[PDB]
Amino acid sequence: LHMDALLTKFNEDRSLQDENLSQPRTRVRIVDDNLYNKSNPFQLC
Amino acid sequence: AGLRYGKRAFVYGEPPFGYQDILNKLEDEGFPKIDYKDPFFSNPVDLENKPYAYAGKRFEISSTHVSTRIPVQFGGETVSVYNKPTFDMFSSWKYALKPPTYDAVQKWYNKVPSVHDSLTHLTLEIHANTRSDKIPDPAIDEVSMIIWCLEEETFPL
Amino acid sequence: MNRWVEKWLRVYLKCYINLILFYRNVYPPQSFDYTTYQSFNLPQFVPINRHPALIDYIEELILDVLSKLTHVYRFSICIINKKNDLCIEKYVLDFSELQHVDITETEVFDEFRSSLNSLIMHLEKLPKVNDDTITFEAVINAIELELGHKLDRNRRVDSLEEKAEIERDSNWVKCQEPKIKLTSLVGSDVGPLIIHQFSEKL
Amino acid sequence: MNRWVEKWLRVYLKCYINLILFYRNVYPPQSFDYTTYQSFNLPQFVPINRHPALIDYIEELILDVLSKLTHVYRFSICIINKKNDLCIEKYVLDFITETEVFDEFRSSLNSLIMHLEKLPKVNDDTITFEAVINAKIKLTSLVGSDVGPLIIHQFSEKL
Amino acid sequence: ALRSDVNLTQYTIESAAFNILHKRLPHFSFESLTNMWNAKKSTTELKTVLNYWLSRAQINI
Amino acid sequence: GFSYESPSQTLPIFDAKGIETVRRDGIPAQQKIIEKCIRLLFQTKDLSKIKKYLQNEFFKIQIGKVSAQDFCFAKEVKLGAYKSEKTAPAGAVVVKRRINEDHRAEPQYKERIPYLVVKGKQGQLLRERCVSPEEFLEGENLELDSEYYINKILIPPLDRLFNLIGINVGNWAQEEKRSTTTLSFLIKKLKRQKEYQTLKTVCRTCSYRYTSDAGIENDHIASKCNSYDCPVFYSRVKAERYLRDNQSVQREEALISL
Amino acid sequence: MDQKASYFINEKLFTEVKPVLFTDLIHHLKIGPSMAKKLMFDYYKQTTNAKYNCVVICCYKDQTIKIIHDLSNIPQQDSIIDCFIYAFNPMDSFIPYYDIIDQKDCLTIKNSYELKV
Amino acid sequence: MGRINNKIDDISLIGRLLICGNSVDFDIKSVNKDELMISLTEFSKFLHNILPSISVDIMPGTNDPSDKSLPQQPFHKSLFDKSLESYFNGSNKEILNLVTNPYEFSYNGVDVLAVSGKNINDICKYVIPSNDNKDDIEHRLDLMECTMKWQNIAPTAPDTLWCYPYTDKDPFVLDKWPHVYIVANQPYFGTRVVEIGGKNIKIISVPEFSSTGMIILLDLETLEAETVKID
DNA sequence: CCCTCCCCTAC
Numbered sequence A: 001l002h003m004d005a006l007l008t009k010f011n012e013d014r015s016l017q018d019e020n021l022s023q024p025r026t027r028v029r030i031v032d033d034n035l036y037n038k039s040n041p042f043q044l045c
Numbered sequence B: 001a002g003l004r005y006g007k008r009a010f011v012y013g014e015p016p017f018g019y020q021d022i023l024n025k026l027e028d029e030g031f032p033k034i035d036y037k038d039p040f041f042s043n044p045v046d047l048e049n050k051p052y053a054y055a056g057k058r059f060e061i062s063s064t065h066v067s068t069r070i071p072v073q074f075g076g077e078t079v080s081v082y083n084k085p086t087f088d089m090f091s092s093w094k095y096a097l098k099p100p101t102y103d104a105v106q107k108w109y110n111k112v113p114s115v116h117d118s119l120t121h122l123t124l125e126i127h128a129n130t131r132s133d134k135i136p137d138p139a140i141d142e143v144s145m146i147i148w149c150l151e152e153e154t155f156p157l
Numbered sequence C: 001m002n003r004w005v006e007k008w009l010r011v012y013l014k015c016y017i018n019l020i021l022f023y024r025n026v027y028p029p030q031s032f033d034y035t036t037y038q039s040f041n042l043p044q045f046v047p048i049n050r051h052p053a054l055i056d057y058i059e060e061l062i063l064d065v066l067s068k069l070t071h072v073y074r075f076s077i078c079i080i081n082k083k084n085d086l087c088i089e090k091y092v093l094d095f096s097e098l099q100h101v102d103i104t105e106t107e108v109f110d111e112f113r114s115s116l117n118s119l120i121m122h123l124e125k126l127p128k129v130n131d132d133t134i135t136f137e138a139v140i141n142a143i144e145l146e147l148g149h150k151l152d153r154n155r156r157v158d159s160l161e162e163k164a165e166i167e168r169d170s171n172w173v174k175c176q177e178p179k180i181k182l183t184s185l186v187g188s189d190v191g192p193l194i195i196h197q198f199s200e201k202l
Numbered sequence D: 001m002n003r004w005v006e007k008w009l010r011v012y013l014k015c016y017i018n019l020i021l022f023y024r025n026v027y028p029p030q031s032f033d034y035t036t037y038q039s040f041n042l043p044q045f046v047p048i049n050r051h052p053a054l055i056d057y058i059e060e061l062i063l064d065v066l067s068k069l070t071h072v073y074r075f076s077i078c079i080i081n082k083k084n085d086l087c088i089e090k091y092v093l094d095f096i097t098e099t100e101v102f103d104e105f106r107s108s109l110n111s112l113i114m115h116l117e118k119l120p121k122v123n124d125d126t127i128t129f130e131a132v133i134n135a136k137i138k139l140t141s142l143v144g145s146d147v148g149p150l151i152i153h154q155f156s157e158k159l
Numbered sequence E: 001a002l003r004s005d006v007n008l009t010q011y012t013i014e015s016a017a018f019n020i021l022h023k024r025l026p027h028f029s030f031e032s033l034t035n036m037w038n039a040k041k042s043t044t045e046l047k048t049v050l051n052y053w054l055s056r057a058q059i060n061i
Numbered sequence F: 001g002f003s004y005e006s007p008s009q010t011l012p013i014f015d016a017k018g019i020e021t022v023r024r025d026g027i028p029a030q031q032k033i034i035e036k037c038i039r040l041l042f043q044t045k046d047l048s049k050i051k052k053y054l055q056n057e058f059f060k061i062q063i064g065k066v067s068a069q070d071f072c073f074a075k076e077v078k079l080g081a082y083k084s085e086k087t088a089p090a091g092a093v094v095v096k097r098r099i100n101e102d103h104r105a106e107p108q109y110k111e112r113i114p115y116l117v118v119k120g121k122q123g124q125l126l127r128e129r130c131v132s133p134e135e136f137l138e139g140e141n142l143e144l145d146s147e148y149y150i151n152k153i154l155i156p157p158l159d160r161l162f163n164l165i166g167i168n169v170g171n172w173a174q175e176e177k178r179s180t181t182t183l184s185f186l187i188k189k190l191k192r193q194k195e196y197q198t199l200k201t202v203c204r205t206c207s208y209r210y211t212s213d214a215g216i217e218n219d220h221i222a223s224k225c226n227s228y229d230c231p232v233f234y235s236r237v238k239a240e241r242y243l244r245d246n247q248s249v250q251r252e253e254a255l256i257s258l
Numbered sequence G: 001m002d003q004k005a006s007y008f009i010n011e012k013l014f015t016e017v018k019p020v021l022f023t024d025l026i027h028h029l030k031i032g033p034s035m036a037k038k039l040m041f042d043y044y045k046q047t048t049n050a051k052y053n054c055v056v057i058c059c060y061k062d063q064t065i066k067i068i069h070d071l072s073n074i075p076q077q078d079s080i081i082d083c084f085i086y087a088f089n090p091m092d093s094f095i096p097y098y099d100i101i102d103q104k105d106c107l108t109i110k111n112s113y114e115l116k117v
Numbered sequence H: 001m002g003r004i005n006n007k008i009d010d011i012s013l014i015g016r017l018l019i020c021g022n023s024v025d026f027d028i029k030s031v032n033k034d035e036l037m038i039s040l041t042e043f044s045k046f047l048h049n050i051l052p053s054i055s056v057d058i059m060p061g062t063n064d065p066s067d068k069s070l071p072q073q074p075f076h077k078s079l080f081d082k083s084l085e086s087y088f089n090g091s092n093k094e095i096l097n098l099v100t101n102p103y104e105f106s107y108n109g110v111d112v113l114a115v116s117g118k119n120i121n122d123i124c125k126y127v128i129p130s131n132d133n134k135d136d137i138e139h140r141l142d143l144m145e146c147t148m149k150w151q152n153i154a155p156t157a158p159d160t161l162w163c164y165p166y167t168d169k170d171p172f173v174l175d176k177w178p179h180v181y182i183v184a185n186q187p188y189f190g191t192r193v194v195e196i197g198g199k200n201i202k203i204i205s206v207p208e209f210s211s212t213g214m215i216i217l218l219d220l221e222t223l224e225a226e227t228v229k230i231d
Numbered sequence I: 001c002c003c004t005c006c007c008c009t010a011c
């Protein structure tokens, strides 16, 4: 298939759903437990 | 034949010198056959009237810049303009410096800038322990290594 | 105001000359490399030549033009053929009062980006120019000045500024001004720099 | 007027003849002064011959051409190839303020320099020159003086 | 012999080795060699001093 | 002058006689400087390039960007063939000062003992400073006498060579948020650190001749090389002095306040 | 809206000559990414005066992203899960420019933490 | 940010971003503050545009404006545009964290030890005339496995380490095995799980993004690394 | 502002 046929197949059937933009999806929380504990071994003066 | 002269044309006298006799006549007149380059300043700022003299010997050192070169004279007297210029409105000007050549850039880019008849030889070296960098003395410091080497090229047997 | 305009105009002229030399095959395209720094932060990834002599030539030309700026109202990079001295292409850069002496550099670089994009879009449509004896030239149109008449006093130089003034006054010669085809382009409409662009073919 | 045009035409013709003599192989190099003089405040180097006889000959030729400038309408300098007697090249010059004529001659001489410095080299001891006064050809049009009432055209031939 | 034959500056074993044989030899003080030769550990140091004097003896030829 | 022993010879031969480029009565720096100036004069005939080169060299010597090895004299010392003690040359003073601490450090007949010159107070005859390379590289506050070196070891021979032309060389010598300065300091520090690491790698590779090792204790064995006949050693001690100093810039406040 | 977007694209393509991305439409019209792709495709249609070079990218399976250059030999057309228009380039060399963007309300995914000032 | 893939159900599972070094390429032999500032402003534009959507953990590299030794300190609070002054105020560290060159991120309990990749790149600059009985991905994976086996992150101390790394307690001598061992700035990409004394360490070789711009997505529920190529 | 003493280079 040509490039125009791919665009006609994909973009014409666009869903345009779930894109509220007012209540965006919150990213999953991943924490760094070594942020404040103590003694970073590789931190030199 | 070749390039025609025209309908009505004349010719001037033949020059006195040719391609070969030119230098031979230039030397006989009281001039060097080839006038090599004297020490000169390429920067006219660095001139500073340096060639003044030395031990009673007057030297003439000049520059090749446009500011120091004298105009071409016609008849022994320099021809120069004395009156002030007359600038006219709406003029056009052209850059005189020639740009680099196409071929020059390509050439720059392509370069991408049975009998014993000798003497036997033996060598010896010595290592002695010293005491706090004292350049060991042969009266208080003893020998520890007598590494030796024998020259195998001339050694027979 | 001569405070910051002298750097932005220098960058613009550098990118202008380099783009004209690149997209018209005046020099081999292998000697050009897309960059953003050529002793000045460029507004784009402009193909700048890396020849030692050509860089110095362009820099001296731009400095001379910027020195004469107060009287120059037009600057043209003429493309002349070598088999016969004839202007086949001419890219005019108008300087109508330049809003000179009488500012959020990002906006200046945005305007320069628009102007250079227009110039590139115009140059990409012209037919391919063969190498091997295609060359260029530089012509300015001044308001009121007379060049070449500063060497009439032997002008004993004292520093580099006076020597530069002399060699810049002496580096220009006088000149004069069918099926011409003029094509206007996008200029710079920023406050201090009001520049216009043009083009000539055939 | 007719005052400044005379002196500036003298200097222009001297530089013209010397350039045509040096940039070809009519007379050998190392026989000119390539680092001393300046022609018309031009940045390029102007060569002037060192032998006083040739310089005096050129000056006398220029004075004799200017003495009868009203009758001549073309002053050409032909390049004759020896052992063939065929004019290979023929540089031709066809026929009111001091500054105007100065700038016109400056531009004309600069054009002459730019045209001469891009020609193929010539082998030695094969060319003699001969100036002519008019009282397959490759043509090239050069810059000329149009301000003064003595408008001159400059063009060259080859082969 | 080297002073009489070749004209160089220092006329030391390292300088002569570099100027005649094009060999650059490290140089250790008499105290460093002593500290290496008295190291109960660090076989590398003993090998170092041994090869030091062996090269000094071989370059003389 | 440039010698052409045959017409087919294309490149000339720099044939000098008697001048400071062949005499061992000076320093290696003056030989290179004089040879470069003479080649510039013979090839280009340009007095501006020579002036620029000489001014650059004088500025480098004045600042302290020299190799510190090209400024080492070397003169034969006849330690017994001298008339008296006050007539002994500069090298004999160093030799005797070394003998007084170690009598075994007595040189052989006609030995080449090197020495350098440093700064001094009013007077301070040349014999009075006369530091050896060992004393100079271990001294805390010792800098080469740039004035003495430049003038009395560069100006006389160039004056001779260029007064034969008509120019005086002595006149050429008399003439929380911060991203710019902090980044410049970082560039300087990183350049110096990379140069130091390169020098250490070079020394570690050179020390492979003896150790035949590559891991640790090879950098330790190579760190004790005091070969005064190697240019990498002087650069190494200079890099060490530079890295052990300027602690004010290398802190938590490098003009960035954090 | 297909009216403001067309005018904005025409302006940023012809008056202020610059390559326009679909994220620019996202930031200017405050719309989602899919709606921006739909508007870009709609502007690619009705293009009797076509004076630009469309930049088409397609996302294959196994999470691969490619920018189509030849537009004649698209590898593995069966594995394509999406294929949209990325930008409209008036010139030949794409070479866009990226500046500061204030994504105050045009975000579709926010990080779990909030900026503490 | 979820603009290209449009699968917000799966893109919202990428909790953090970890640049493992080599953010700017230059030569300190010939460089000034201008062009380095241009590259740093480009990087700062990227950071300011991507931070409102995802958290970033920046790590120094081998050719970045930082120390040439292996324990490289964080870049600086400077070297970034003034638009990022709100992230460097001290309280906003969970969204942007300039970190030391070696570091053990405790990502929700998954202790991952990350190195920019100078140790392996310094081991590979040697030619050992052994191991016969060549610059392949399996060879570098074996080198990383041996680094984990010997419990020494930097076997070539004179090349990677610097004077005074520590006193009487060296940090490169491993005192605890991590779960994931990341060595970046490698020519090729490859993963390998190794069993050392009843334990299991997953080694990951992150390739450069300049050439072969792949992005590794490492899961934390099963430790499965998948790649995302960008052409 | 001239002397001796020392260095070492050139035929």
Ligand code: SF4
Residues within 6 Å of the ligand: E024, E025, E026, E027, F202, F203, F204, F206, F207, F222, F225, F226, F227, F230, F231, F232, F233
């Ligand atoms: S300094 Fe000279 S001698 Fe000492 S190690 Fe480095 S190279 Fe070998």
